[PDB]
Every structure is written in C-alpha cells, then in structure tokens.
Design a protein around this ligand. Structure first.
Ligand code: CLA
Ligand code: CLA
Ligand code: CLA
Ligand code: CLA
Ligand code: CLA
Ligand code: CLA
Ligand code: LHG
Ligand code: A86
Ligand code: A86
Ligand code: A86
Ligand code: KC2
Lengths: 193, 175, 194, 180, 47
C-alpha cells in the first residue's frame, strides 16, 4: 500500500524508492495497493512464462498425446511461439477456465488487497469457505508447506528476492517475445527462439 | 527430522541428507516426504517381486485374461514391458481406475490427514483386515517399520535397476 | 448439522455425517424427516428393483399367463429387455399394481398418525401398518443393538442398490460409463408408467 | 454531493425500493425510478412469478434438445419448431393447467389492491412449501435472495437461449459448440 | 467463429498502405456521406 511500507527497495537503485517519473506521488495510496498486487502478479506470471519459454526453445516436451491424435512434439514443432496457437482449443479453454476460477476466488476473499489487505498475498486456499462448493483442500501456494521452516526475517528476504527475480523475469520474457517479433533486437537469442 | 524413522546404523546412524532437502522442510513437508517414501517403497517392492516372479519361471495364472480376445496369461509374454503392453487397454484402464479410487479413498477417508496431523503412509482401510499382525508390541512394530523402509529403498534400487536393464541392458551387472 | 442423531453415519466415509453440500442444515427437522423417509423409500425400491432386474436378466418367470384374455404369457414377456417387460405388462395389470402401491402409500401417510414431518417423527417407520412389514416376525428375535446394526445395513445396502440400478440401466444406453466390458442388456433407461 | 445515492448507480438518488424491506433491496437498482410509480409489493410478486416461470423454462429449453419424453410425437430438438410441430391440444392442456393453478391460487385477488388487501399476504408467498423449508427462519433470507437472483438469471438466460436460436436456426448447445 | 486469442491471433497487424501521393479534394468529396448525392443515399440506415 503506502509506497513506503512496501519492501521492494533494493541495492540496484540505491536504498530508496525507485519512482523516477513520480507515478506514486500522483496516486491516493489506494492505487499503490493495486500496483503491488499487479507487480507481483506480473513478475510471477513472467517467471513462469520465462522458464516455460526456455523449456520450449530447448525442445523438451512431454512424452506425447496432448490430445487424442496430436502429439506434444508435433504441437510444439515450430518452436514455443507458435506452440500456443498449435495447442488444442479445448485444452486451451480448460486452462483459461481454471485460471478464471483461481483469479475469481482470489478476488472474492473478504479483506481483498485494495480494501485493507496485503497486496501480493494470494489466499493459500482459494476454493474453501464457498457454500455449495467442494475442493480437496490443496492450498494453492506452497502446497507442501516449504515455508514453515522459514522465520519472519528469512521470508522477508525471500520476498525481496521474489520481487527482484519477478522484475528480471518480466524483462526476460518481453525480451524473448520482442526478439522473436523483431530479429536481432535481442542479440543473445539463437535460431531456436 | 531425527524424530522420524528410517535412520539406521548403515549411514552413520544419522540423517542421510547430502543435498540438505530436510533443512527446508516444515513438519508437514517432512510428513509429505515420508508418505511419498513409504508409497514409493511399497510400490517398488510389489513391482520388483512381480517382475522377478514372472521372469524367473514359477507358477502363473491358470486361465484366460479375456475370453472375447482370447489372450492367455501364458501368451502374454512372461516379460515385463511387453506383457504389460499385451494386456488389453481396458484391463489397464480398470487397474488404474481401481488404484485411483483406492488413492482417492486413502486421501478423503482417513480423517487425520498425514499432511494435516496424521500418521504418514497408513491405510486403516486396507492393512490386514482380519488382524494377521495386530497384537504385537510397539517396539517390534517400530523396528519392523524400520525394516520396511530399509528393504523398500533397496527395492526402489532393484526396480529401477530392472527398468534400466530393460532400456539400457549394458548398464547393470547380470540380467 | 441437523443430521447427527439420525442413524445413517457410515464406516466408509468415516464417522462424520457426509453432507458436503449441507442440505441437512437447509430446512426444518420436518424437511430432514422427509429426506430420511425419501432415502429409505428409494433404498427399499432400489433393492427390490435390483432383485427384479436380476430376475429379468436371468429369465426365471412365474408359471402361468398374465391375462387369460390377452395373449401375454410370462414366458412371452421374459424375452424382452427388463424395462420392455413392464412396457409389455397389460395396461389393466399395471393400473391395479399402481393402485395397490398407491393404497399402501396413502395408508402409510394416513394411519401412521405421528407423521414423519411432525413431532415424534419416526421417518422410515412403516410398522404400524399391521402385517405389512415383517409379517412373520423375523426381526422379533433381535435386540436394540442388533436392530440398529440391521437398520444401518439396510441404509448401506439400499444406497448401494440405488447406485447399482441406475448404473445397470444407463451402462448400455450410454457406452463407456461403467469400465467393465460386460454386455449389459439393451433397452430404455426410462419408461413412462402407462 | 448526492445526499442519498443509489447503492448500485451512485450518481443517482436513492430509489424508493432501496428504503424498503423486500429482499434484495439494497442493490438499489432502479435508474428509471419505477418503484416510485409501480406498487413495490405487486412488482415483487411479478418478479418472483416471472423468475419462477423462467427458471422452469431455461432448464427445459436447454435439456429438451438432449432428452425426449419417451415416445412423444412431434418432437424437435429446438424449442421453436418443437412448439410449431407439437399437437395444439397438448399446449392447450399445459396452458389450462397453468391457468387453473393461477386462478385457484389468486382466487378473488387479481388486482393491485385486492391482492395485498390482506396485510399478511407477502410478495410472492403463495404458500407452496410442501417440505417446509420456511419453518427454518435462519436460512430464510439466504433462500429468498437465492431465489430472486436465480430467477433473474433465468429470465436473462431464457431470453438469450430463445434469441440465439432465432439468430442461428439451431438449438442452444449446437449453436454454442459451433462458436468454439 | 474466429475467437481472437484461442483459435486466432489476438490482434492482427494492419495493412501498411505506404506513403504516397495525396488524393484529390473532388476525389474524396464526391464520395463523402454529406457532399455527394449517392453518399447521402448510402448514409440511410439499411435495417
Ligand atoms: C438449471 C440449472 C440451475 C439450477 C437447477 C440451479 C440451482 C441453484 N443455484 Mg444456480 N446457477 C445456474 C443454473 C442453475 N442453478 C447457472 C447457469 C449459474 C451461473 C454460473 C448459476 C449460478 C449460481 C450461483 C452463483 C448460486 C446459485 C445457487 C443456486 C442454488 C440456490 C440456493 C439453494 O437453495 O442452494 C442450496 C444448496 C444446494 C441445493 C446444494 C448445492 C448445489 C449443488 C452442488 C448443485 C449441483 C451442481 C452440479 C453437480 C454441477 C457442478 C459443476 C440452487 C441449487 C446459489 C447457491 O447457494 O449455490 C450453492 C448460488 O450461490 N446458482
Ligand atoms: C542487454 C541486452 C540487450 C542488448 C545487448 C541489446 C542490443 C540491441 N538491441 Mg535491444 N533489447 C533488449 C535488450 C538488449 N538489446 C531488451 C530486453 C528488449 C526488449 C524491450 C530489447 C528490445 C529491442 C528493440 C525493440 C530493438 C533493439 C535493438 C537493439 C540493437 C540496437 C540498440 C541500440 O541502438 O541501443 C542504443 C543504446 C544506447 C544509446 C544506450 C542506452 C542508454 C541511454 C542513455 C538511455 C536513453 C533513454 C531515453 C532518453 C528514454 C542491439 C543489437 C534494435 C535493433 O537493431 O533491432 C533489430 C531494436 O529495434 N532492442
Ligand atoms: C435420493 C436419495 C437419497 C436421499 C433422499 C438421501 C438423504 C439423505 N442422505 Mg444420502 N445418499 C444417497 C441417496 C440419498 N440420500 C446415496 C445414493 C448415497 C451414496 C451411496 C448417499 C450417501 C449418504 C451418506 C454417506 C450419508 C447420507 C446422509 C443422508 C441424510 C443427510 C444429508 C441430506 O440432507 O441429504 C438430503 C439429500 C437429498 C434431499 C437428495 C437430493 C440430491 C440431489 C438434488 C440430486 C443428486 C444427483 C446425483 C448426484 C446424480 C439424508 C437423510 C447422511 C446421514 O444419513 O446422516 C445421518 C450420511 O452420512 N447419504
Ligand atoms: C399409485 C400412486 C402412488 C401414490 C398415491 C404415491 C404416493 C407417494 N409417493 Mg410414490 N410411488 C408410486 C406410486 C404412488 N406414490 C410407485 C408405483 C412407486 C414405486 C416405484 C413409488 C415410489 C415412491 C418413492 C421412492 C417415493 C414416493 C413418494 C411418494 C409421496 C409423494 C411424492 C411426490 O409428491 O412426488 C412429486 C415429485 C415427483 C418427481 C414424482 C407419496 C407418499 C416419496 C416419499 O414418500 O417421500 C418421503 C418417495 O420418496 N413414491
Ligand atoms: C416453462 C416450462 C416448460 C414448458 C412450457 C415446457 C414445454 C414443453 N416441454 Mg418441457 N420441460 C421443462 C419445462 C417446460 N417444458 C423442464 C424443466 C424439463 C426438464 C429438463 C422439461 C423436459 C422436457 C422434455 C424431456 C420434453 C419436454 C417437452 C415439452 C413439450 C411437450 C410437453 C411435455 O411433454 O412436457 C414434459 C414435461 C416434463 C418432462 C416435466 C416438466 C417439469 C415441470 C415444469 C416441473 C414443475 C413441477 C415441480 C418441480 C414439482 C413440485 C413437487 C412438490 C409438490 C414436492 C412442451 C413444448 C417434450 C419435447 O421436447 O417436445 C418438443 C419433451 O420430450 N420437456
Ligand atoms: C470467451 C472467449 C474468449 C477467450 C476464451 C479468450 C481468451 C484469450 N484472449 Mg481474448 N478475446 C475475446 C474472447 C475470448 N478471448 C474477444 C471477444 C475479443 C475481441 C474483443 C478478444 C480479444 C483478444 C485480444 C486482443 C487478445 C486476446 C488474448 C487472449 C488470451 C489472454 C486473455 C487474458 O489475458 O485475459 C485477461 C482477462 C481479463 C482482463 C478479464 C476481462 C473481463 C472478464 C472476462 C469478464 C486468451 C487466450 C490475447 C492473446 O492473443 O493472447 C495470446 C490478446 O492479445 N483476446
Ligand atoms: C466470460 C467470463 C467472465 C465472467 C462471466 C460470468 C461467469 C462466472 C461467474 C461465476 C459467479 C458465481 C458467483 O456467485 O461467485 C461470487 C461468489 C462470491 O464469493 P463468496 O463471498 O461466496 O466467497 C468469499 C468467501 O465467502 C469464501 O469463504 O464467489 C464465490 O462463491 C467464490 C468464487 C468461486 C469462483 C470459482 C468459480 C468460477 C466460475 C466457474 C468457472 C466456469 C465459468 C463457466 C465456463 C465453463
Ligand atoms: C547477456 C545479454 O546480452 O542479454 C541477456 C538479456 C536477456 C535477453 C534479458 C536475457 C534474459 C532473460 C532473463 C534475464 C530471464 C530471467 C528469468 C528469471 C529471473 C526467472 C525466475 C524464475 C523463478 C522461479 C521459477 C521461481 C520458483 C520458485 C519456487 C518454486 C519456490 O517457491 C522456491 C522455494 O520453495 C523453495 C524451494 C523453498 C524455500 O527455500 C524458498 C521458496 C519458498 C521460495 C538473457 C537470455 O540472459 C540474455
Ligand atoms: C551384486 C548385486 O547384488 O547386484 C545386483 C545389483 C542391482 C543392479 C541393484 C540388482 C538388483 C535388484 C535388487 C537387489 C532388487 C531387490 C529387491 C528387493 C529386495 C525387494 C523386496 C521386496 C519385498 C517385499 C515385496 C516384501 C513384502 C512383505 C510383505 C507382503 C509383508 O507384509 C511383510 C510382513 O508379513 C511379514 C513377512 C511379517 C510381519 O511380521 C510383518 C509384515 C506383515 C509387514 C541386480 C540386477 O539384481 C544385480
Ligand atoms: C466398479 C464397476 O465398474 O462396477 C461395480 C460397481 C457397480 C457399478 C455399482 C455395480 C453394481 C451394482 C451393485 C453393487 C448393486 C447392489 C445392489 C444391492 C446392494 C442390493 C440389495 C438388495 C437387498 C435386499 C433385496 C434385501 C432384502 C432383505 C430383507 C427383506 C430382510 O428380511 C433382511 C433380514 O434382516 C432382516 C430384516 C431380519 C432378519 O431376521 C432376516 C434377514 C437377514 C433376511 C457392478 C457393475 O455390479 C460392480
Ligand atoms: C484389480 C483390478 C480389477 C478389478 C477390481 C476388476 C473387477 C471386475 C469386476 C468386479 C466388480 C467385474 C464384474 C469385472 C469384469 C471383467 N473384467 Mg475386471 N477387474 C480388474 C482387472 C481386470 C483386468 C486386468 C482385466 C479385466 C477384464 C474383465 C472382463 C473381460 C472379460 C473378457 O473380455 O473376456 C470382465 C467381464 C479383462 C478385460 O477387460 O479384457 C479386455 C482384463 O484383461 N479386469 N472385473
């Protein structure tokens, strides 16, 4: 929320708030919550996308039969860029609707993030507490509870690392897509991608 | 970590964690690891015993596996991968469905979940329903659990050795 | 929930009342008594129906003829699939079978004065209709704990039976539902009563 | 600087329906302020009746393509040519059944004043509750709000199904699956 | 139907018509919806 309390300050920009254009000074502190929720969501989606894109460029795919006749290698033949278009529309819709359920359940939680909740703290158990619905209580984030061994300071440091790696992953995934769309724009990319 | 079972005098009588995976584990993560280890060990023991029994001769099932297709257990092949391929796909599907309903019952029927404060890798639905080993002492039960973990890990090695012999026959000795 | 004192807690789901959608909480104790009476009726009808379906598949039939007027022998009717058997029963025979069933249901709701949707419910209690349930007194040898066990077994068997009857009825009509490859009898999954 | 803004359209004044005790009142959705003109109880009686009809219709319209009443003549998977093809003396009997129910339920109370002349008589409380869910008064508000919302959604859904069938000429599920 | 995103690209690039000579004022005035006799008639709602 308030641009201050948030933890994202790091050594790369000096130990200060990095707001060159003063976007944070023209908001009423209600929108800074939305910006840290969206920043963390962007960073997390971006690092997932980055590792997935690197996997696709390397050519690693599942053993086969994404669908009935289609194979994983065949549907990822033309690199990772066209892989999404190649994937079956039905499975595409199932990915989209499970993401819809996740991102609707995350929004429906009572404290929210904009209205006085933690911006970034996705609820661990999105589908519980819903009358008339049942799910097998598998918590969305950290299902195996890796974070129990971590103390407060350690998880603060790891949240800092999360923000840094998410920002770097945003830069990386945009580099990948831009390098594909404009050859030679990202010189560290080979013909694989 | 040391409170849990599996540790024995072979590996210096201390926890075998060369990569330090137990140090990043909460109590529940340790429960998940132990449950996975138990399930893998017993699956590997069943698999290696079945593979050795089939490949080393001995008795086989007497009758047919499918009257409509007329497949005999003798004609399956008496070797692991090819026999499993020759099993009808419907038979494979219903075997996997039986295992799936068993595991869904294991997850949703035992009320104290092994992750949520229950014993890791216990099946009160299915373990000696008539009580073959129920009256034994607690110390003998615990050391028998230790034996289970030990030879079940050895069975993991055995079944993976059999798979690596099937796919890379020049790797293992013998076989 | 409202479903704690009720006698239906199983050993398979654990000793907690399996009401994942919380339908027991929604409504009155009268509503839950209606639910219990409906469950027991479905249980009993499903046990009788599965036995009847097994009889029809086996082909065993009464020696005689259904109607001396119409040329409808039990031997003739046994050759059809189980639901076409009822479709082939005479209209008047079906009418009087339903008349007997409806008389039984009306008297169950009438003569059992402490109603299931009322104080002193006794939801599945149809004893009170004298000589209807257990005319021979077979359960009369049983104590309280044995009676409770038998009631729990009734509910378990009937629940399984109402699953199984629908399973056999739909398995052939929609192939691939039941994983087993047994060739279930053909025919409808639903018959209109007349 | 609206003194009493509408909870739904906060740039408009609060309608009379917002300051009322019927169920679902807080939304306050009434841009046209029809609650000031129309009698509010009479419109909840109409809202509930329409929603009940529509939430019987929408499952019926959506499942009559998939399923047939065994042996029924004149069946067509799409509702419009279904009603065109079905014998008129079946639709007539359905309408007679509905009319009998309406007349006997609303006997001597068919006008805005005659209906709700009795202070007890509530909007849409015709007394149809064989299983007596209404005796439990803890969940009565939940069930009332759920009935209202489901009825409204069913009105919109049935309208959409019917007009999509008009657009495409094909039943609801076929028209939907030919998009993806 | 081409659902943009799943069975079709989200946004297709537009046709770059290239920089070239200007049109004539009469050319785009005798086709306007308000200063052309047929343009006026082509501006009535079809419905
Ligand atoms: C013909 C279809 C149909 C039917 C019969 C119903 C019926 C119902 N809806 Mg509605 N609904 C429909 C279509 C339908 N809906 C559609 C298309 C949508 C848009 C997504 C909604 C969205 C919706 C919402 C958002 C809610 C309802 C709710 C309800 C319930 C009302 C309150 C109640 O008594 O719950 C008491 C509870 C029960 C009777 C048991 C729980 C319901 C079970 C799970 C229904 C079976 C689902 C089925 C297996 C498919 C799962 C996928 C009732 C069960 C409310 C509710 O309370 O839901 C629980 C509710 O919150 N509905
Ligand atoms: C460290 C990684 C890296 C490297 C080595 C390069 C290298 C290159 N990029 Mg870039 N690029 C990168 C990351 C990188 N890119 C990323 C992450 C993206 C995604 C956003 C892009 C997107 C991109 C595009 C879209 C294009 C390039 C292009 C180029 C080429 C010329 C750029 C130029 O003139 O810079 C000049 C740099 C400076 C003069 C110094 C910068 C510092 C000044 C002071 C900042 C001024 C700020 C301004 C006032 C606001 C060159 C091969 C161009 C090209 O040739 O494409 C074929 C081109 O069109 N890149
Ligand atoms: C139509 C038959 C029917 C009916 C009326 C009931 C009624 C009941 N069951 Mg249920 N039950 C049934 C079939 C039925 N059961 C079947 C086939 C099974 C699976 C084998 C179970 C397994 C089961 C268990 C394990 C338990 C109950 C219990 C109960 C009671 C409390 C829950 C409740 O409020 O349910 C009300 C339910 C209804 C009104 C039925 C409506 C169902 C929806 C609308 C359609 C379902 C479609 C289906 C999935 C296809 C209640 C008396 C609990 C009990 O006895 O606690 C003391 C309990 O522990 N039942
Ligand atoms: C011949 C006429 C007749 C009569 C008067 C009744 C009367 C009754 N039956 Mg029915 N019933 C009949 C034939 C008849 N039945 C037959 C032939 C069978 C055997 C298949 C059944 C099997 C049956 C069951 C399994 C149940 C009833 C139930 C009911 C009640 C009314 C349910 C209702 O309104 O459903 C309206 C809604 C429908 C979908 C129909 C009531 C006691 C229910 C009951 O008593 O619940 C507590 C109930 O669960 N009946
Ligand atoms: C607005 C409501 C509505 C209307 C006007 C119609 C109209 C029609 N339906 Mg029906 N239908 C409806 C709802 C409706 N349906 C619903 C909800 C279903 C369940 C999915 C069906 C399922 C259905 C089928 C499968 C078929 C029709 C067909 C027809 C046509 C012939 C009549 C017939 O056979 O009805 C049959 C009626 C039923 C099978 C049941 C109707 C359910 C009623 C409305 C529920 C009300 C009772 C209530 C729930 C009980 C309370 C119990 C309490 C006392 C305890 C006709 C165009 C036939 C067709 O396609 O012709 C072209 C046909 O074969 N309908
Ligand atoms: C139900 C149909 C449908 C589905 C399943 C999708 C699915 C998708 N679209 Mg979309 N899209 C649709 C209709 C649909 N679209 C329509 C009608 C249009 C025309 C206005 C577009 C225009 C469009 C564009 C321009 C783009 C997509 C893209 C996408 C992807 C990202 C979605 C996203 O970020 O959501 C975020 C969700 C929200 C912001 C919530 C919106 C409001 C909710 C749904 C209510 C995804 C594959 C992107 C793509 O190509 O990815 C590869 C992309 O660039 N779509
Ligand atoms: C086009 C897509 C845009 C949305 C269009 C409308 C459809 C979705 C609306 C569902 C609203 C229904 C609605 O009433 O939800 C609103 C409701 C409000 O939340 P509650 O207050 O119940 O939950 C917060 C706490 O109470 C929980 O303890 O949310 C839920 O109950 C939790 C969210 C579950 C969300 C998971 C389900 C997602 C929907 C199913 C995905 C499939 C859609 C069908 C396609 C196959
Ligand atoms: C050199 C040159 O010229 O150009 C360069 C520039 C250019 C184009 C930008 C390039 C690029 C791309 C870049 C920079 C890509 C960066 C990608 C990035 C930064 C990707 C992060 C992923 C993070 C993940 C998946 C995290 C998982 C995290 C998980 C699963 C966890 O929760 C771990 C954890 O649970 C444990 C196990 C237990 C605890 O102990 C701690 C926690 C709870 C946290 C190139 C190719 O380098 C070339
Ligand atoms: C030099 C050398 O060796 O090279 C090897 C190395 C290499 C490559 C690894 C090889 C291998 C594979 C090996 C060694 C594989 C070994 C596999 C192994 C050793 C597999 C055990 C299974 C045990 C089972 C199924 C036990 C069930 C036990 C059951 C059913 C019970 O319930 C037990 C119990 O009822 C009792 C009996 C008494 C009760 O009180 C307690 C209970 C109720 C619990 C090669 C290829 O062979 C060559
Ligand atoms: C997995 C898969 O794919 O398929 C599987 C699962 C699936 C689909 C469900 C299948 C099915 C169908 C199933 C399982 C069907 C089950 C049917 C069932 C369970 C049917 C019970 C009838 C009971 C009656 C009539 C009892 C009357 C008993 C009466 C009237 C008594 O007097 C009892 C009595 O106690 C008293 C009251 C007093 C005592 O003094 C005397 C006795 C003891 C006599 C399959 C295809 O088969 C196999
Ligand atoms: C542990 C696993 C398991 C269970 C729990 C289980 C239970 C039941 C039940 C009890 C409810 C019935 C009623 C039943 C019936 C049939 N089973 Mg089945 N079965 C299991 C495993 C296998 C395997 C491996 C095969 C198989 C088959 C058949 C055939 C086919 C006969 C034929 O085609 O002549 C029929 C009729 C074979 C097959 O489908 O071959 C194409 C086949 O290979 N089953 N099976």
């Amino acid at each position: 929320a308030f641009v201050d309390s948030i933890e994202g300050v790091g050594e790369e920009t000096g130990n200060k708030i990095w707001d060159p254009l003063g976007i944070s000074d023209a908001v009423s502190d209600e929108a800074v919550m939305w910006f840290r929720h969206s920043e963390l969501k962007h960073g997390r989606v971006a690092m997932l996308a980055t590792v997935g894109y690197m996997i696709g460029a390397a050519g690693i795919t599942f053993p086969g039969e994404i669908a009935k006749g289609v194979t994983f290698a065949s549907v990822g033949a033309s690199g990772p860029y066209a892989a999404w278009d190649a994937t079956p529309t039905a499975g595409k819709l199932q990915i989209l609707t499970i993401i819809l359920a996740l991102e609707w359940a995350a929004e429906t939680k009572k404290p929210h993030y904009m209205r006085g909740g933690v911006p970034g703290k996705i609820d661990q158990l999105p589908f519980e507490g819903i009358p008339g619905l049942w799910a097998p209580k598998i918590k969305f984030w950290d299902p195996l509870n890796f974070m129990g061994a971590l103390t407060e300071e350690q998880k603060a440091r790891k949240r800092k690392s999360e923000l840094k790696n998410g920002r770097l992953a945003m830069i990386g995934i945009i580099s990948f897509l831009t390098g594909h769309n404009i050859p030679g724009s990202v010189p560290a990319l080979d013909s694989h991608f | 970590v040391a409170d849990m079972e599996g540790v024995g005098p072979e590996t210096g009588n201390k926890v075998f964690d060369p990569l330090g995976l137990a140090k990043i584990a909460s109590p529940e993560t340790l429960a998940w690891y132990r449950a996975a280890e138990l399930k893998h060990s017993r699956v590997a023991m069943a698999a290696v015993t079945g593979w050795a029994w089939v490949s080393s001769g001995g008795p086989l099932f007497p009758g047919y596996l499918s009257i409509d297709q007329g497949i005999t257990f003798e004609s399956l092949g008496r070797d692991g991968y090819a026999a499993w391929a020759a099993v009808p796909e419907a038979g494979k599907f219903q075997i996997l469905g039986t295992i799936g309903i068993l595991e869904l019952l294991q997850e949703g029927s035992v009320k104290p979940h092994y992750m949520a404060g229950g014993t890791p890798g216990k099946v009160p639905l299915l373990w000696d329903p008539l009580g073959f080993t129920t009256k034994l002492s607690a110390d003998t039960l615990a050391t028998k659990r230790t034996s289970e973990l030990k030879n079940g890990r050895l069975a993991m090695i055995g079944v993976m050795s059999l798979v690596s012999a099937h796919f890379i026959p020049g790797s293992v000795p013998l076989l | 929930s409202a479903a704690d004192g009720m006698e239906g807690i199983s050993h398979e789901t654990g000793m907690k009342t399996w009401d994942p959608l919380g339908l027991a909480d929604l409504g009155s104790p009268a509503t839950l008594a209606f639910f219990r009476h409906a469950e027991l009726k479905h249980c009993r009808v499903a046990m009788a129906a599965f036995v009847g379906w097994l009889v029809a598949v086996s082909g065993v039939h009464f020696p005689g003829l259904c109607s001396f007027s119409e040329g409808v022998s039990f031997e003739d009717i046994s050759k059809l699939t189980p639901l076409e058997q009822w479709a082939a029963v005479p209209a008047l025979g079906k009418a009087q079978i339903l008349l007997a069933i409806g008389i039984i249901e009306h008297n169950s709701e009438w003569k059992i004065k402490p109603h299931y949707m009322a104080a002193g419910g006794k939801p599945g209690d149809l004893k009170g209709l004298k000589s209807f349930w257990d005319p021979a007194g077979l359960t009369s040898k049983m104590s309280a704990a044995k009676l409770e066990r038998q009631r729990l077994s009734e509910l378990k068997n009937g629940r399984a039976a109402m699953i199984g009857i629908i399973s056999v009825l739909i398995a052939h009509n929609v192939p691939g539902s039941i994983p087993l490859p047994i060739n279930f009898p053909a025919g409808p999954s639903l018959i209109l009563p007349f | 600087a609206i003194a009493k803004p509408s909870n739904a359209v906060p740039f408009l004044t609060a309608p009379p329906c917002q300051s009322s005790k019927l169920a679902g009142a807080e939304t306050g959705f009434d841009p046209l302020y029809l609650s000031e003109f129309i009698d509010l109880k009479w419109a909840r009686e109409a809202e509930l009746k329409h929603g009940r009809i529509c939430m019987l219709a929408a499952p019926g319209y959506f499942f009559q393509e998939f399923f047939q009443l065994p042996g029924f003549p004149g069946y067509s998977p799409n509702g419009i040519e279904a009603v065109s093809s079905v014998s008129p003396e079946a639709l007539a009997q359905i309408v007679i059944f509905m009319s009998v129910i309406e007349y006997n339920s609303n006997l001597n109370k068919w006008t805005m004043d005659t209906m709700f002349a009795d202070p007890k008589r509530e909007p849409g409380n015709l007394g149809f509750d064989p299983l007596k869910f209404g005796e439990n008064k803890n969940t009565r508000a939940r069930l009332e709000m759920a009935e209202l919302k489901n009825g409204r959604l069913a009105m919109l859904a049935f309208s959409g199904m019917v007009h999509q069938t008009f657009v495409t000429g094909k039943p609801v599920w076929a028209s939907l699956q030919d998009i993806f | 139907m081409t659902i943009p995103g799943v069975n079709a690209p989200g946004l297709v690039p537009a046709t770059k018509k290239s920089v070239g000579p200007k049109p004539e004022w009469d050319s785009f005035r005798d086709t306007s919806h308000f200063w052309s006799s047929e343009g006026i008639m082509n501006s009535v709602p079809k419905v």
